Tab-separated table of C-alpha atoms and ligand atoms in Angstrom:
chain	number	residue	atom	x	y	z
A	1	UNK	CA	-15.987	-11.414	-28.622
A	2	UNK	CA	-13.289	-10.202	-26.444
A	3	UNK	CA	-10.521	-13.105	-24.912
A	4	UNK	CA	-9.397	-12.812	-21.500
A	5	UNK	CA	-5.791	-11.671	-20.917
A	6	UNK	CA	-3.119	-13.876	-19.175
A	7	UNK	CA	-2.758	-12.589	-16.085
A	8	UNK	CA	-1.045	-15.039	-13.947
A	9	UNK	CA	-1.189	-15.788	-10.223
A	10	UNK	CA	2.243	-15.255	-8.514
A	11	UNK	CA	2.546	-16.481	-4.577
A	12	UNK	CA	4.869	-13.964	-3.334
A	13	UNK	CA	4.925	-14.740	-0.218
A	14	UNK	CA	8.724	-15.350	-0.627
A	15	UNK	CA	9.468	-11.905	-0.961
A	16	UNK	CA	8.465	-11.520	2.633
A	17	UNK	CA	11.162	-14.296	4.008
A	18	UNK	CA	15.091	-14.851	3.724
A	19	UNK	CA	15.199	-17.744	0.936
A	20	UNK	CA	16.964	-15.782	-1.748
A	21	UNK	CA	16.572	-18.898	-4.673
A	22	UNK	CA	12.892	-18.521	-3.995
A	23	UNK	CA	12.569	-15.400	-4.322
A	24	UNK	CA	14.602	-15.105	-7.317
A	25	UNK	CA	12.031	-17.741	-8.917
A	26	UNK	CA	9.428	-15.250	-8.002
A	27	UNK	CA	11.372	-12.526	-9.185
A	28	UNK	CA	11.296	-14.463	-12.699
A	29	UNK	CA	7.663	-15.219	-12.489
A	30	UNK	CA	7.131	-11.050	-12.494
A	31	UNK	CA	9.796	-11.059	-15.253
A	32	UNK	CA	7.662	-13.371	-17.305
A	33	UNK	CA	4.507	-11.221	-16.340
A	34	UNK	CA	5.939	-7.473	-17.021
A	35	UNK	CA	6.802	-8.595	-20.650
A	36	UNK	CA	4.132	-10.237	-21.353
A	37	UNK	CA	0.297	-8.749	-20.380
A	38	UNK	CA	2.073	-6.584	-17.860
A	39	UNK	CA	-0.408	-7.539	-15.339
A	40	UNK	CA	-0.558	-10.261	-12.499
A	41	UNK	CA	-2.586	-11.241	-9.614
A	42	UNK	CA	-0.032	-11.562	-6.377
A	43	UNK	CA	-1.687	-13.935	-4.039
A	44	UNK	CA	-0.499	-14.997	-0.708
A	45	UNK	CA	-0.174	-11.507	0.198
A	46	UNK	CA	-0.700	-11.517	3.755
A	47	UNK	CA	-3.269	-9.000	3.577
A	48	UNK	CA	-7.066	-8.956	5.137
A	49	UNK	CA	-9.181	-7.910	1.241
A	50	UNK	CA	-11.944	-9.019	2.659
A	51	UNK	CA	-12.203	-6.694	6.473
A	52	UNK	CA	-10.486	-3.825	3.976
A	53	UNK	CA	-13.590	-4.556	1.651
A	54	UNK	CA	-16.121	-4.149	4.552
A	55	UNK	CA	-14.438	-1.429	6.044
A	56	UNK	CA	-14.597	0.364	3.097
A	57	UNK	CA	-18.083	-0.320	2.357
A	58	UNK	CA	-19.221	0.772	6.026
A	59	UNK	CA	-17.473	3.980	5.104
A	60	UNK	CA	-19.091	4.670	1.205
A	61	UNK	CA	-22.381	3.525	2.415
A	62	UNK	CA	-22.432	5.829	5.212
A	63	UNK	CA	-20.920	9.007	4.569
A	64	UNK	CA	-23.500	11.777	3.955
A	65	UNK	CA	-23.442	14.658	1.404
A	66	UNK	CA	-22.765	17.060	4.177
A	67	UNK	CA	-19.991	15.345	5.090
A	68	UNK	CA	-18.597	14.841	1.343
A	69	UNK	CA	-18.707	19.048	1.167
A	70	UNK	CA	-16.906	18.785	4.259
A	71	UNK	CA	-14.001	16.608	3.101
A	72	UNK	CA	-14.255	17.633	-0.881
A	73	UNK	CA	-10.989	18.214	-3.014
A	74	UNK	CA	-10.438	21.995	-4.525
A	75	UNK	CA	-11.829	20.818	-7.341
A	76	UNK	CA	-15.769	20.239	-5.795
A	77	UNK	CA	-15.002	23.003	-2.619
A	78	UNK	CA	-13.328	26.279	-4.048
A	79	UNK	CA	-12.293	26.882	-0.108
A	80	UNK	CA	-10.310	24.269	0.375
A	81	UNK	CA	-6.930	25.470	-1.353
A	82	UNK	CA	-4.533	22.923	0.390
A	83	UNK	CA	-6.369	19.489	-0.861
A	84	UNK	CA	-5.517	18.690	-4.291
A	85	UNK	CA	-4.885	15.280	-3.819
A	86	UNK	CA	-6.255	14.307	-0.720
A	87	UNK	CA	-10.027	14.697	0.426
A	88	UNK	CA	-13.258	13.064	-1.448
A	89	UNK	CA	-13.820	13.269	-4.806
A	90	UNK	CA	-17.605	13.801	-5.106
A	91	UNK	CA	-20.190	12.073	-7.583
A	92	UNK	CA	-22.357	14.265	-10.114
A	93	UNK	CA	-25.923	12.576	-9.785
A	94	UNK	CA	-27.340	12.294	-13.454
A	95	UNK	CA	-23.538	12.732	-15.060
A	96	UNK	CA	-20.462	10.909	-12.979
A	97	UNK	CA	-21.190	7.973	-11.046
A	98	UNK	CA	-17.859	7.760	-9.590
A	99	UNK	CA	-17.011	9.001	-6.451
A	100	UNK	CA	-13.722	8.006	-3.805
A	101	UNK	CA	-11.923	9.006	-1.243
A	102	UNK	CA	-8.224	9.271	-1.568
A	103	UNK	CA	-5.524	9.869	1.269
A	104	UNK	CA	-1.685	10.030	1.624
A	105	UNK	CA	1.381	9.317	3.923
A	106	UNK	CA	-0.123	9.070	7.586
A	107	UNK	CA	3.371	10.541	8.598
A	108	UNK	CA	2.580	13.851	6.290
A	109	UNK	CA	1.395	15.703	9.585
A	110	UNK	CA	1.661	19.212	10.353
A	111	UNK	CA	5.173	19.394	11.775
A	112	UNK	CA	6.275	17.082	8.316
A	113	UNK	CA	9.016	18.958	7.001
A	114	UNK	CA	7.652	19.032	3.292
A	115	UNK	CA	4.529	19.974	5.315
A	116	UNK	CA	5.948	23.065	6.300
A	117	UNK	CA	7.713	23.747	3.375
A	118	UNK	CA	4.285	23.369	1.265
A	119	UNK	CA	6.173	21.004	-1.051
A	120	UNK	CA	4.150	20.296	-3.857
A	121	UNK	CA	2.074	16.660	-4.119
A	122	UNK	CA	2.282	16.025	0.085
A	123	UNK	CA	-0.410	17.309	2.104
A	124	UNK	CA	-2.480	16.726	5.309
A	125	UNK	CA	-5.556	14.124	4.909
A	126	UNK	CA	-8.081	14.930	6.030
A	127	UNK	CA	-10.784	12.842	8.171
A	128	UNK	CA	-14.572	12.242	8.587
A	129	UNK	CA	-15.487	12.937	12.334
A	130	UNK	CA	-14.364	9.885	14.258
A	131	UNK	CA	-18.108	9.448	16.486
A	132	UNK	CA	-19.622	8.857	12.878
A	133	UNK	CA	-17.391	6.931	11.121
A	134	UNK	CA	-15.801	4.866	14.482
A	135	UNK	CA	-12.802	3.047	13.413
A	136	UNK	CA	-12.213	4.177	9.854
A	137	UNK	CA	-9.506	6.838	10.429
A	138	UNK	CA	-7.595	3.770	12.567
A	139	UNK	CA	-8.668	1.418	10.056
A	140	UNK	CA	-7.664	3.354	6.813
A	141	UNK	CA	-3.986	4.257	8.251
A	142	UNK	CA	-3.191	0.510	9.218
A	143	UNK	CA	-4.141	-0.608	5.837
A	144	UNK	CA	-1.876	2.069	3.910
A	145	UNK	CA	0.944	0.582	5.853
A	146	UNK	CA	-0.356	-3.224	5.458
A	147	UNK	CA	-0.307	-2.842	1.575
A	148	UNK	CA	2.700	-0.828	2.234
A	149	UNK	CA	4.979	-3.809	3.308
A	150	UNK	CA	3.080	-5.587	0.264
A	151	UNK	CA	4.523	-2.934	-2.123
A	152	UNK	CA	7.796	-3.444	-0.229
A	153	UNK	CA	8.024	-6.814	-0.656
A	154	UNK	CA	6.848	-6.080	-4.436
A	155	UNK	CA	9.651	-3.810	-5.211
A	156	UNK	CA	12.106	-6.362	-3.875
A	157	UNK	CA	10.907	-8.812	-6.405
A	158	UNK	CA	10.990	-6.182	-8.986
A	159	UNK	CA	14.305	-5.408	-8.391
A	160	UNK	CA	15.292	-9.024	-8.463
A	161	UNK	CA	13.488	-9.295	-11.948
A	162	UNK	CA	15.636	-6.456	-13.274
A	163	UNK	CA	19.155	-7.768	-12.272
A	164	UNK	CA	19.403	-5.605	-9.531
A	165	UNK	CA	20.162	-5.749	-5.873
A	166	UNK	CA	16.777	-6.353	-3.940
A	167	UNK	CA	16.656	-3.068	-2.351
A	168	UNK	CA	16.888	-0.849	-5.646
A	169	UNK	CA	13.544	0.182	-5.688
A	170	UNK	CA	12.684	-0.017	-2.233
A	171	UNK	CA	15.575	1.973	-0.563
A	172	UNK	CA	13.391	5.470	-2.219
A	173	UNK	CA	10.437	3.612	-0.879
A	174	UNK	CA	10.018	4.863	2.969
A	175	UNK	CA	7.640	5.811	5.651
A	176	UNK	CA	8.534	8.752	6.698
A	177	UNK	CA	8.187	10.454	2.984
A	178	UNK	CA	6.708	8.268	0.268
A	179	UNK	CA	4.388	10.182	-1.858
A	180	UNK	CA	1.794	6.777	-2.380
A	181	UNK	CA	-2.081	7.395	-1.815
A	182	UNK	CA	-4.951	4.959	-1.420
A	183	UNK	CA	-7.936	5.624	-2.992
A	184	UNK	CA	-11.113	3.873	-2.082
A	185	UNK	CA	-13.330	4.710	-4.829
A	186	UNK	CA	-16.943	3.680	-5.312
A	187	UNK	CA	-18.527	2.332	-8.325
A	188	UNK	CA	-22.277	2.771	-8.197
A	189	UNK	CA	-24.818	0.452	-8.927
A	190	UNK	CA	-27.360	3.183	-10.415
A	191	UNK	CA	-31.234	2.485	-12.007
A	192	UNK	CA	-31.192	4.664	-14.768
A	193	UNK	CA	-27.617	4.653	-15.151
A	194	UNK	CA	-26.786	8.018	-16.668
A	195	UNK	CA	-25.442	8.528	-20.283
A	196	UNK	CA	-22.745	10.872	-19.242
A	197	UNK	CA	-21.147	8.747	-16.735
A	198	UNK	CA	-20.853	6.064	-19.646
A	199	UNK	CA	-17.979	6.631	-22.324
A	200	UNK	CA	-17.839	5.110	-25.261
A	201	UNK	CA	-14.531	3.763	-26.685
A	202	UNK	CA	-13.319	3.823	-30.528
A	203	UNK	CA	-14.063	0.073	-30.694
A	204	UNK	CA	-17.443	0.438	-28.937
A	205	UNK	CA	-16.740	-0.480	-26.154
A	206	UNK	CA	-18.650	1.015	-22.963
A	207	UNK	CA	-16.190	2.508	-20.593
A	208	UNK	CA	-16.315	4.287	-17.037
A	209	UNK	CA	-12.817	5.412	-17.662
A	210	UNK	CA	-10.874	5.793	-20.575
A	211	UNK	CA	-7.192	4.058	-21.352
A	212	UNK	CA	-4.088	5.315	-19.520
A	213	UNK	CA	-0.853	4.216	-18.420
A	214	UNK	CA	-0.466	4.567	-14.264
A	215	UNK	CA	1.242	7.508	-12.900
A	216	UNK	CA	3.326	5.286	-10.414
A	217	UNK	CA	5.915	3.186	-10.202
A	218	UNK	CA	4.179	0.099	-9.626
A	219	UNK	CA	0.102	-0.163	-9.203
A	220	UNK	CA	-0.971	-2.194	-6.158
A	221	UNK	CA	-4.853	-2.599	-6.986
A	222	UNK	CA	-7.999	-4.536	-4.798
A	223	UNK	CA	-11.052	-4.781	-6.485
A	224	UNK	CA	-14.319	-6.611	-6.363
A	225	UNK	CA	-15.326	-9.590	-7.964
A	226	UNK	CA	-17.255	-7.638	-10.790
A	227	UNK	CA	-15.011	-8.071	-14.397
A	228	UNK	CA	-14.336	-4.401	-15.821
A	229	UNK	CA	-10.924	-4.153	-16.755
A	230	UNK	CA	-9.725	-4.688	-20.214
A	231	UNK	CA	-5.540	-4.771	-20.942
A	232	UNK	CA	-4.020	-3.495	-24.871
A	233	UNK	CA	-1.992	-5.892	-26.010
A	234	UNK	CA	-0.702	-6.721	-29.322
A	235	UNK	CA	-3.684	-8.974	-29.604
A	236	UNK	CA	-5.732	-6.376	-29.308
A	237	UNK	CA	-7.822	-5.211	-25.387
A	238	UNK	CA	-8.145	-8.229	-23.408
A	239	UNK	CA	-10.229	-9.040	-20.741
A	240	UNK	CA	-8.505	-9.142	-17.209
A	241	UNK	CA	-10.349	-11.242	-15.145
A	242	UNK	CA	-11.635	-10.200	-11.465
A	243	UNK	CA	-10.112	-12.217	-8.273
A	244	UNK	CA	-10.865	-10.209	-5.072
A	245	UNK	CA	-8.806	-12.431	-3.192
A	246	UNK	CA	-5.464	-11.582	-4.949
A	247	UNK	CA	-3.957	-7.852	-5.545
A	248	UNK	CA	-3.549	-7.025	-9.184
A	249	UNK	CA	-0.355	-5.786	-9.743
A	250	UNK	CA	0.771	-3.282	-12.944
A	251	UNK	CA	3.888	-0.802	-13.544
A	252	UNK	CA	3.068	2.633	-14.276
A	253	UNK	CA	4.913	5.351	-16.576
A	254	UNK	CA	7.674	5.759	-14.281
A	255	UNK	CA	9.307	2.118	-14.015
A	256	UNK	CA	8.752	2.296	-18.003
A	257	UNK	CA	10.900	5.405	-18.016
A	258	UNK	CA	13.635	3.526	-15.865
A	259	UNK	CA	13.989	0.832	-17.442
A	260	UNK	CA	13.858	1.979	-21.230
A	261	UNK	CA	10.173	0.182	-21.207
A	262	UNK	CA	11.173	-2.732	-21.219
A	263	UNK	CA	8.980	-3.275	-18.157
A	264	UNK	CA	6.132	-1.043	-20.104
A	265	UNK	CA	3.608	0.756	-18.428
A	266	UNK	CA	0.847	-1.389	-19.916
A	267	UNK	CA	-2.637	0.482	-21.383
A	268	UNK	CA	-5.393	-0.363	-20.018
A	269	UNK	CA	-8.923	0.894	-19.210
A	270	UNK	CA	-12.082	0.473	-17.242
A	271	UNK	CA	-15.525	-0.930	-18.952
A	272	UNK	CA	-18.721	0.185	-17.949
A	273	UNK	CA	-20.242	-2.080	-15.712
A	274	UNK	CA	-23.963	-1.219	-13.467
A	275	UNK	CA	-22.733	-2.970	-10.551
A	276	UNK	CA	-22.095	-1.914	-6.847
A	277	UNK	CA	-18.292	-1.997	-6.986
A	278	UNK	CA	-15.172	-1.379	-4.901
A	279	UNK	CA	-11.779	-0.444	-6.997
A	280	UNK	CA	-9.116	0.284	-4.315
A	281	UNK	CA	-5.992	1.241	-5.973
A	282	UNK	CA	-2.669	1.879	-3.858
A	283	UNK	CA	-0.241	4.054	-6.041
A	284	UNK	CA	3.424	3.049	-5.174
A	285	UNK	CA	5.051	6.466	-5.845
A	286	UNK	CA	8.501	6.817	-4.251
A	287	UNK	CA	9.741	10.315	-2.349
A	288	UNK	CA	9.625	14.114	-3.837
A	289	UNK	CA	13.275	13.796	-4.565
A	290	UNK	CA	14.346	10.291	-4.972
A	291	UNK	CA	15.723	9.801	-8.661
A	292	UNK	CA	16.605	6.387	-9.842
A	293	UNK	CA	19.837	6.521	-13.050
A	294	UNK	CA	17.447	5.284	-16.004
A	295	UNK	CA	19.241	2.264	-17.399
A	296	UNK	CA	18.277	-0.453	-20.200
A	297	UNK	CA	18.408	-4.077	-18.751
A	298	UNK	CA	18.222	-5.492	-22.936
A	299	UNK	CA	21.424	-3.570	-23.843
A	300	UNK	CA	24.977	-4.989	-22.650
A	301	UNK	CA	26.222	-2.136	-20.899
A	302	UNK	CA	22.943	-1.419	-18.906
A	303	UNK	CA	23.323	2.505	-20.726
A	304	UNK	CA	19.806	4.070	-21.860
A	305	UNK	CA	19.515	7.308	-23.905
A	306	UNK	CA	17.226	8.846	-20.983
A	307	UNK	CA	17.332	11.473	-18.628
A	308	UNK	CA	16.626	11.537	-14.874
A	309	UNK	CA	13.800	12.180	-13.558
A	310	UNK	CA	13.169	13.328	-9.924
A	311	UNK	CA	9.620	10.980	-8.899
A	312	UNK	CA	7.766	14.694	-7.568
A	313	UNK	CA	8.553	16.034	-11.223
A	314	UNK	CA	7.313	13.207	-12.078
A	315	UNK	CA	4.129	12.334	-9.828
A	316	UNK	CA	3.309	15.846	-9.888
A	317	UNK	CA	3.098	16.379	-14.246
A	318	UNK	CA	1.790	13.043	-14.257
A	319	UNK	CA	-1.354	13.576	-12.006
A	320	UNK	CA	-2.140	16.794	-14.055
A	321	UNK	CA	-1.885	15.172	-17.414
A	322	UNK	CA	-4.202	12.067	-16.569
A	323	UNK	CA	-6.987	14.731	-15.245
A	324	UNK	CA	-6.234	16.597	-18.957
A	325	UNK	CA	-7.168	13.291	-20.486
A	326	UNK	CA	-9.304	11.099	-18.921
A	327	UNK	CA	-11.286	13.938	-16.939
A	328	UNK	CA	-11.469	15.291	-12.917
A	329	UNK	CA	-12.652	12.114	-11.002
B	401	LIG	C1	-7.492	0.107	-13.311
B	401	LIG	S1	-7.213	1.859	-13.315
B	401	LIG	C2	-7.005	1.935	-11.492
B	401	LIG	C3	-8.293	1.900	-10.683
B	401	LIG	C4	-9.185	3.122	-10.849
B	401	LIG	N1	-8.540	4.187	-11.641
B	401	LIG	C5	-7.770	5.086	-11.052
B	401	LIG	O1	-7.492	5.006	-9.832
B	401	LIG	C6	-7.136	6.136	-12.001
B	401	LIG	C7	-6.427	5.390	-13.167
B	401	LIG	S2	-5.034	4.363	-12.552
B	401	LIG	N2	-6.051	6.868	-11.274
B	401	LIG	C8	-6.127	8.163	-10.957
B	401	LIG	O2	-7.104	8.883	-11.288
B	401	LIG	C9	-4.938	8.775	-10.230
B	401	LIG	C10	-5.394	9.059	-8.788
B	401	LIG	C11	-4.219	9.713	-8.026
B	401	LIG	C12	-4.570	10.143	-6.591
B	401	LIG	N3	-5.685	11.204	-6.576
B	401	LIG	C13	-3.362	10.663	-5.895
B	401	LIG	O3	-3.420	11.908	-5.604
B	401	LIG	O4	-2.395	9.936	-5.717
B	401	LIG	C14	-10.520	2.732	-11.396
B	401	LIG	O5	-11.049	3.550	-12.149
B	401	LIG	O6	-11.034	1.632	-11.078
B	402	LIG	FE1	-4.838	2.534	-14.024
C-alpha cells in the first residue's frame, strides 16, 4: 500500500569541475530535492560502490568474535574507556541483528592536538590486525577520503542552493579536523529472525530502526540493492527506492538548524527486511568548533530568530540523544 518517494537522480559531477552555470543548475536540482522529499540519489560520483561493497563484505564476513571483543565500543567492552564512537558495535544473537564498524578522521592520531587534549567526540580508531584482515585498514582510510571529496563537492552545491558563496559549508569542512565517521554496518540475513531485533512502528510497519532526523550536516549514504528505507512526508512514509550505484544524499538536524529548516532534516526510518545487507553511511559533521551564523534564506534580510551553535555541541548532544531514542546500536 505504500508509494515510493521522489527521490531524484542528480549528476553532480559538475561540482567537481570549474563550469560555474553548471553547477549552479545542479545546485538548483538539490534546491528542488531539499524541499521537496529531502532525499536524492547523486550519481556520477566518481566513486568505486562496488570494490567499497566487496571490501566491506571481505571484512563483515571475516572478522571473528574474538576479534569483535577486541575492537568493541565502551558500550559492549567496559575496558575500553576511550572508544565511544569508534570501534565495533557488536550484534546480540537472538535480540539485535545489527552489528558495524564505525571509524573517524584518519588524521585523529596520537600527536592530534584534540587528541591530546581528550576533546570530546575525536578519538583514535582503532584496527583489526593487518595479517588477518590484509588491505582493509589501507582500504577503509582511502575510502573516508574518496567520499570525502564527494561530500566536498556536495557542500559546494549546497552552498550554491542556499545563495551562498560555494565554499560556505565546506571552508569548516577539512582534513586535518572534521569530526565525520564511516560506519560500515551489517544487516544480517538471519533463519529464525529474532522478534527483538524487529520493531514494530505505530502504523505497523516492521522496522530495524526507528524514525530520526540525522545528526549531521549532510548524510552521504551507500547501500545495497535491498529496499528498506521509508521517507515522512506530508503524504504520509514513502518508500525510497534502493540504487547501489548512486549515493543517497539527506541533511541532518544541523543544516535544518542553519537554515531555519527550510532545508529540513527529513524523518525517516529503516524497515525490517531478512536480507544480507550493507548500509554504509558517511556522516558529514564539520570541526569541534566551527559555528556557521544561522540565517533564513525565505526571509528578505537573511535574519533567523536562532542561536549559534558550535557543530561539537552539537555532534556531541546529538549522538547521545539518538542512542536515548532509537537504542545503543
Ligand atoms: C538511513 S539511516 C542511516 C543508515 C543506518 N542508520 C544509522 O547509521 C543511524 C541513523 S542515521 N545513525 C547512527 O546511529 C549515528 C552513528 C554515529 C557514529 N557512531 C559516529 O560516532 O559518528 C541504517 O540503519 O541503515
Ligand atoms: Fe538516518
Amino acid at each position: 500500500s505504500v508509494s515510493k518517494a521522489n527521490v531524484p537522480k542528480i549528476d553532480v559531477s559538475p561540482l567537481f569541475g570549474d563550469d560555474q552555470a553548471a553547477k549552479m543548475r545542479v545546485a538548483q536540482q538539490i534546491d528542488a530535492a531539499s524541499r521537496d522529499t529531502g532525499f536524492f540519489y547523486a550519481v556520477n560520483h566518481g566513486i568505486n560502490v562496488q570494490r567499497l561493497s566487496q571490501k566491506t563484505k571481505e571484512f563483515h564476513m571475516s572478522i571473528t568474535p574474538e576479534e569483535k571483543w577486541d575492537l568493541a565500543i565502551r558500550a559492549y567492552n567496559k575496558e575500553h574507556q576511550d572508544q565511544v564512537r569508534a570501534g565495533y558495535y557488536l550484534s546480540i544473537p537472538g535480540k539485535k541483528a545489527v552489528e558495524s564498524f564505525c571509524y573517524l578522521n584518519p588524521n585523529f592520531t596520537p600527536d592530534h592536538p584534540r587528541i591530546q587534549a581528550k576533546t570530546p567526540t575525536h578519538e583514535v580508531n582503532v584496527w583489526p590486525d593487518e595479517t588477518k584482515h590484509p588491505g582493509f585498514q589501507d582500504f577503509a582510510e582511502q575510502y573516508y577520503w574518496d567520499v570525502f571529496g564527494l561530500s566536498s563537492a556536495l557542500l559546494k552545491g549546497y552552498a550554491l542552493a542556499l545563495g551562498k558563496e560555494e565554499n560556505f559549508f565546506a571552508r569548516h569542512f577539512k582534513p586535518d579536523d572534521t569530526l565525520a565517521s564511516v560506519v560500515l554496518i551489517r544487516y544480517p540475513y538471519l533463519d529464525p529472525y529474532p522478534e527483538a531485533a524487529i520493531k514494530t512502528a505505530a502504523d505497523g510497519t516492521k522496522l530495524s530502526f526507528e524514525w530520526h532526523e540525522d545528526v549531521s550536516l549532510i548524510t552521504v549514504l551507500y547501500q545495497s540493492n535491498v529496499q528498506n528505507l521509508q521517507v515522512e512526508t506530508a503524504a504520509g512514509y514513502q518508500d525510497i527506492e534502493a540504487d547501489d550505484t548512486g549515493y543517497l544524499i539527506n541533511c541532518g538536524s544541523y543544516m535544518a538548524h542553519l537554515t531555519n529548516n527550510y532545508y529540513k532534516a527529513p524523518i525517516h526510518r529503516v524497515k525490517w527486511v531478512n536480507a544480507e545487507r550493507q548500509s554504509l553511511p558517511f556522516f558529514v559533521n564539520l570541526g569541534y568548533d566551527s559555528v556557521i551564523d544561522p540565517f533564513d534564506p525565505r526571509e528578505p534580510n537573511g535574519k533567523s530568530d536562532r542561536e549559534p551553535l558550535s557543530y561539537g555541541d552539537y555532534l556531541q548532544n546529538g549522538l547521545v540523544s539518538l542512542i536515548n531514542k532509537n537504542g545503543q546500536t
